[PDB]
Amino acid sequence: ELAKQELEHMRKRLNVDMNPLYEIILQWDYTRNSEYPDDEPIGNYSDVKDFFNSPADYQKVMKPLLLLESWQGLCSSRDREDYKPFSIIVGNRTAVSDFYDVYASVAKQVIQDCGISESDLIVMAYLPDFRPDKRLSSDDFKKAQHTCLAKVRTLKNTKGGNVDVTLRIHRNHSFSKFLTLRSEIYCVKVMQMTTIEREYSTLEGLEYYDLVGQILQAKPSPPVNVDAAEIETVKKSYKLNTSQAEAIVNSVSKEGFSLIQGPPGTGKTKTILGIIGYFLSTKNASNTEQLLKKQKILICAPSNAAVDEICLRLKSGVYDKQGHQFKPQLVRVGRSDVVNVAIKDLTLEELVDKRIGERNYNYRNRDLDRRNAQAHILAVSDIICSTLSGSAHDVLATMGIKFDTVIIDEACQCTELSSIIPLRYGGKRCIMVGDPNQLPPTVLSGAASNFKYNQSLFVRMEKNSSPYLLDVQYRMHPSISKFPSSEFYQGRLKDGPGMDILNKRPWHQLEPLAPYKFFDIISMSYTNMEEIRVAIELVDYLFRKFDNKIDFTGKIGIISPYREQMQKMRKEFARYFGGMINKSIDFNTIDGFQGQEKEIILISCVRAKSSVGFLKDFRRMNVALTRAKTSIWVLGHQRSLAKSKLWRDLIEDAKDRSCLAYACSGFLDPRNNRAQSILRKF
Ligand SMILES: Nc1ncnc2c1ncn2[C@@H]1O[C@H](COP(=O)(O)OP(=O)(O)O)[C@@H](O)[C@H]1O
Ligand SMILES: [Mg+2]
């Protein structure tokens, strides 16, 4: 019939109650030494299931894991963050629900120096034997007998450079006995609660989401049938390859969830730009003038960096189905981490500044003008870009706008609730673009990750459906892309035209500095001095032969699965080369290097159980083998690695391709008779 229940469900999704969240959190013990926030039985926790039967099933599984990650965040900030303590003067209190709203006073300079905002959780402590003689730290709170968690409800500036503070604590907390009028109480910030609150809002309002069925079942929509002429038109107009054009056309033509899988360098973001252009143009091409809200698209990413790259690349305009450029109105919701004028000019706050001018350079008028400008800018916008968390912001929540189409870049680098956040505005189509063949997003709680909390909705859905694969990479030398393609993509991952030309480098003319090489080192620990020495000698030969013609600044990375081996590698490289390699070589583990790339990559394999273990090794190898663009030199012991199918496949592929060389310390030295004898007798 007429579904005003859409408006009712929108209201439900946008107004989730946080009091149940703080009923739990405000009873926690800041001083607790445990992976877990309480002593409930371990069986209360369970793995994230491939398939959920109901929103209640989903919530029963997910809420403990969300709270566990939150607890681990508390612990991390307690044991590391070194937040600066302060003190407050207590006043009256008000009983609200299962809470006490305690009013207090603190200086504005202290609020600013300690970084306290209305989004912060803090811990209070009673330390009557403290004297200003000593410096106060969060260790004093960690070891205190009487502590209490409090949420910063309200911060209001007063006249004399002070701030009225409203803090919320739990009714049941005995610490209230110390909150007598005009008492001095010591405090320190624990953590800012915005992300936890937004994910909790999503988790609890899930049952009113339009795509709740597809989310619970991890089951994207079935493919519809699309016109080959349409795919060709998109290909030509947007200057894409066939896989990208197909992904765009299909994912836009259907509603529900769509998965686009992009291996390294296959054009995930370019395809998203094409999606934006195509969607907006085909949507604009559908007795007194009726007033309608303008169609918008929501573009989200897990991190500010990805959102900012999307914005920067959108500044060149988008294209319609016929290939003609148009410039839709773009708004970046939320301030970014880095400073850049090009991104700053797109932020909602800067757009409001420019729309209102110097008229209010009186305070009521200033706030009213800012609010009206915000409303108008958001109403006339075409594209809304944000982080997955930032999509839950009040500025979007008060637009009165349904965002029926949400696109997510880097969709594998976020938790499931985080990816679900932006669907609260009536989302009926969600196109997630990602690379599942990487390491899962990092979570603070090892236990939570052991319960598979570090798994993205993209991956959980990939279990049940085949994504639209982008199958041409535009980064790596063909000798470097060869084995990744054959080993992970059925030999169907293609190279862009001229990768051999683009990634041809002078040192390629000198053996063994080839584009692709496995060095079998002829010589139960997690380090290998001989691999380290061979890496040193390779880099030394490269430098000696070319660093008077080539600047190796930022050209080289060295990675290994094991941080012990990487520590030893950095130490030995520092000793051998001095400081002159600081700007030439990055050192990291395969995990820590996941988002980086170099022209030259050296891998120290060192050495090579379960399905989880094979999955982690599969992802690590996918990452490691795609970090280089022009040259990759894989150092390892063949017998120490061949117990792994992946490594044996790699070594035997290198053999078949004549890309295996035998190596030991001094193998590049013609005068080293010992090393040359070791080589010759092989
Ligand atoms: N159809 C295409 N034709 C030519 N170059 C492409 C195509 N698709 C992607 N590229 C190139 O591949 C590189 C990776 O682009 P990007 O969209 O950032 O990929 P991803 O987002 O998957 O990392 C870019 O330099 C881009 O110019
Ligand atoms: Mg990208």
Numbering used by the authors: 1096 to 1381, 1396 to 1470, 1543 to 1704, 1714 to 1798, 1802 to 1875
Q: What wording appears in the published article?
A:
Here, the benefit of using a wavelength of 2.7 over 1.9 Å is demonstrated for native-SAD phasing on a 266 kDa multiprotein-ligand tubulin complex (T2R-TTL) and is applied in the structure determination of an 86 kDa helicase Sen1 protein at beamline BL-1A of the KEK Photon Factory, Japan. In this work, performed at beamline BL-1A at the Photon Factory with two real-life targets T2R-TTL and Sen1, we have demonstrated that the increased anomalous signal at 2.7 Å (sulfur f′′ = 1.5 e−) over shorter wavelengths can be harnessed effectively as long as the crystal dimension in the beam path is smaller than 100 µm, and extra material around the crystal and air scattering are minimized.
We applied native-SAD measurement using a wavelength of 2.7 Å on Sen1: an 85.7 kDa helicase protein with 32 S atoms, involved in the termination of non-coding transcription processes.
